[PDB]
């Protein structure tokens, strides 16, 4: 029907407030929920309804800073929350040593991302420590893990690594040649990109691969024109009305961004059917509580609310800022990031 803008603003506001225990599984990734909410409000031009200062302090309390003896550099970055019980410290004093305290790549990414959205200048971010932490996460095959203690490794984290290097405007955080190699090896026989070599190509991993290359400014250099044409074909074939993540799977609102953003980066989103996509996204809108679900008449969540809005943004919805398809923040935010980078180079 129509875009329930006000309701979504309230939805995101509630996400930043207090949640029922039924959401406990989000504990270690509260920072990404904050990101969906803040970046979502930013996208709707309503960051004024939140106290940017309080939130900035909270985010900084999540940074894993190097200890006095700097013997934990390989573990720096940001935590998803304070579940470890480390005493509140908004990146003021040094780092309180702890056997199992370290950053999580997706949190370092959404964390830095949130700081920029809120207006902070990243002066309290130990840039070198984060980059050291990032380097430690990369594997021999070029992909990344999420934490130094070990985890699964795939395209999702390659994207996080790329975003971090881009935001800190320093690529010493990764061995770019090896990352590119990983991205190439993930291309499937059907031409989409998978999470890793041999796996089923997917809309999410294709976005991560393509966006990473664009952030590195090496899209053209890595894939030939023929290859890019094949990838474009695979991506545009994902539209049914809304978009699905892989052949023969039902559509899900978030793919309007995962795939749509990829198509935008490949410069052919303009050739997709806007109306059917918009109609589908809006049909997953929760008219009562706000936010978007993956399917109509389904429960909404922060992730699908944010990506649904970004999907709408791709077609320039009346009332929604333009989204930077590769960085996943508002263009307004990417512009502010540009200034920040300029100001540092002095």
């Amino acid at each position: 029907l129509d875009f329930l803008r006000d309701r979504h603003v309230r939805f995101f506001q509630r996400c930043l407030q207090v949640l029922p225990e039924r959401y406990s599984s989000l504990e270690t990734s509260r920072l990404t929920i904050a990101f969906f909410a803040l970046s979502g409000l930013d996208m709707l031009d309503s960051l004024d309804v939140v106290n940017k200062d309080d939130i900035i302090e909270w985010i900084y309390s999540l940074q894993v800073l190097p200890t006095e003896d700097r013997s934990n550099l390989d573990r720096c970055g940001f935590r998803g929350s304070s579940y470890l019980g480390i005493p509140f410290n908004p990146s003021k004093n040094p780092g309180t040593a702890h056997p199992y305290d370290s950053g999580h790549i997706a949190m370092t990414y959404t964390g830095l991302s949130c700081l920029i959205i809120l207006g902070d200048d990243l002066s309290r971010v130990d840039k070198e420590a984060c980059l050291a932490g990032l380097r430690a996460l990369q594997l021999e095959d070029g992909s990344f893990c999420a934490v130094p203690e070990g985890s699964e490794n795939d395209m999702r984290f390659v994207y996080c690594a790329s975003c971090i290097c881009y935001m800190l405007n320093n690529w010493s955080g990764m061995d770019m040649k090896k990352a590119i190699s990983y991205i190439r090896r993930s291309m499937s026989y059907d031409n989409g990109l998978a999470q890793g070599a041999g796996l089923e190509s997917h809309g999410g991993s294709t976005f991560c691969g393509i966006a990473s290359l664009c952030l590195m400014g090496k899209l053209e250099e890595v894939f030939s024109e023929k290859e890019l044409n094949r990838i474009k074909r695979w991506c545009i074939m994902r539209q049914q009305n809304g978009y699905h993540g892989r052949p023969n799977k039902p559509v899900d609102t978030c793919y309007s961004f995962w795939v749509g953003a990829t198509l935008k980066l490949l410069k052919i989103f303009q050739y997709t059917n806007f109306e059917k996509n918009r109609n589908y996204i809006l049909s997953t809108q929760d008219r009562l509580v706000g936010g978007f679900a993956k399917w109509p008449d389904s429960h909404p969540d922060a992730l699908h609310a944010y990506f649904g809005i970004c999907g709408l943004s791709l077609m320039e919805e009346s009332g929604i800022c333009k989204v930077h398809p590769a960085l996943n923040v508002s263009t307004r935010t990417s512009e502010r990031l540009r200034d920040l980078h300029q100001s540092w180079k002095t």
Partner: protein, 314 residues
């Protein structure tokens, strides 16, 4: 031991065996963001979990505490890591842990942490004997579970268990020829065993796919496989294919077939074929058929492809 919903469950703060430990609370500071409220029981388990973690206590009681922490929140990766540290320190029976994780995964098949945990265990035991059957069970409740297929490919590759996968793939394609995950598996098996350079294999596969396409002509997965195993060899290098497809157009038509033809014609133009201007027109005619009536949702795309062909071959 003592279940979280047992009538006789006792908070850790009331257990004698935990008297010496001072619980460590979580503090989100002055103004918390995205704060989750916890029940007494929940906060109690984690207040002691933090205590044990902070002191890196490699004890048996800590090991049992992780079982409760996991029941409360299986997505906490730190808990799983610590449990692995304890499994080693206490030299626990890993065969028993396999039973544990096997049950956990069945209840939460989409959780990244539980699949990672199982993979570490299998690496430790160097025993993949249970894997293929376990995965087949999970795939039985969700034949497209990305985590299951990923784990299956890892096991097969790591312990070279290729012997029966192609047969497993054939079985699943009969159950649902539209499962894109299975078609991917098929290419995974073949390209990692015989490869496709063996003309006898390529022929067997192309023939197999055409048979599947005839059964269900509107199936992107089957068409993607067919084009996938031939595109790098050169679609135009297979004259009988072009005609066999043109013979399907009458009845077994679909946008996938039309698209395939356009791609064949494009390969021809790319290799300075005979009747360049005639071929180009055959392609353009199809692009417009796709845009105007066969794949209308991609109307603007196909027309864009058309314009691309003209400006490149004229």
């Amino acid at each position: 031991f003592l279940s979280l919903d047992s009538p006789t469950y006792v908070l850790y703060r009331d257990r004698a065996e935990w008297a010496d430990i001072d619980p460590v609370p979580q503090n989100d500071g002055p103004s918390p963001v995205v704060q989750i409220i916890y029940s007494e029981k929940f906060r109690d388990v984690y207040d002691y979990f933090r205590a044990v973690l902070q002191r890196d206590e490699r004890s048996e009681r800590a090991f049992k505490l992780t079982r409760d922490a996991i029941e409360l929140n299986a997505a906490n990766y730190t808990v799983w890591h610590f449990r692995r540290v304890l499994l080693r320190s206490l030299q626990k029976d890993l065969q028993e842990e396999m039973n544990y994780i096997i049950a956990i995964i069945e209840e939460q098949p989409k959780n990244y942490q539980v699949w990672h945990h199982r993979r570490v265990l299998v690496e430790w035991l160097k025993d993949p004997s249970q894997e293929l059957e376990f995965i087949a069970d999970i795939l039985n409740q969700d034949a497209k579970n990305y985590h299951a297929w990923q784990h299956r490919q890892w096991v097969i590759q790591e312990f070279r268990l290729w012997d029966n996968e192609l047969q497993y793939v054939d079985q699943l394609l009969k159950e649902d020829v539209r499962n894109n995950s299975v078609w991917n598996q098929r290419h995974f098996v073949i390209s990692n065993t015989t490869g496709y350079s063996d003309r006898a294999v390529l022929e067997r596969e192309v023939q197999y796919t055409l048979e599947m396409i005839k059964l269900v002509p509107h199936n992107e997965s089957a068409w993607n496989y067919l084009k996938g195993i031939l595109q790098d060899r050169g679609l135009s290098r297979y004259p009988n294919l072009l005609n066999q497809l043109l013979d399907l157009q009458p009845s077994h038509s679909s946008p996938y077939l039309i698209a395939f033809l356009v791609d064949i014609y494009e390969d021809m133009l790319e290799n300075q074929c005979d009747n360049k201007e005639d071929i180009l027109n055959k392609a353009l005619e199809l692009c417009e058929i796709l845009a105007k009536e066969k794949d209308t949702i991609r109307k603007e795309y196909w027309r864009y492809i058309g314009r691309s062909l003209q400006s490149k071959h004229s």
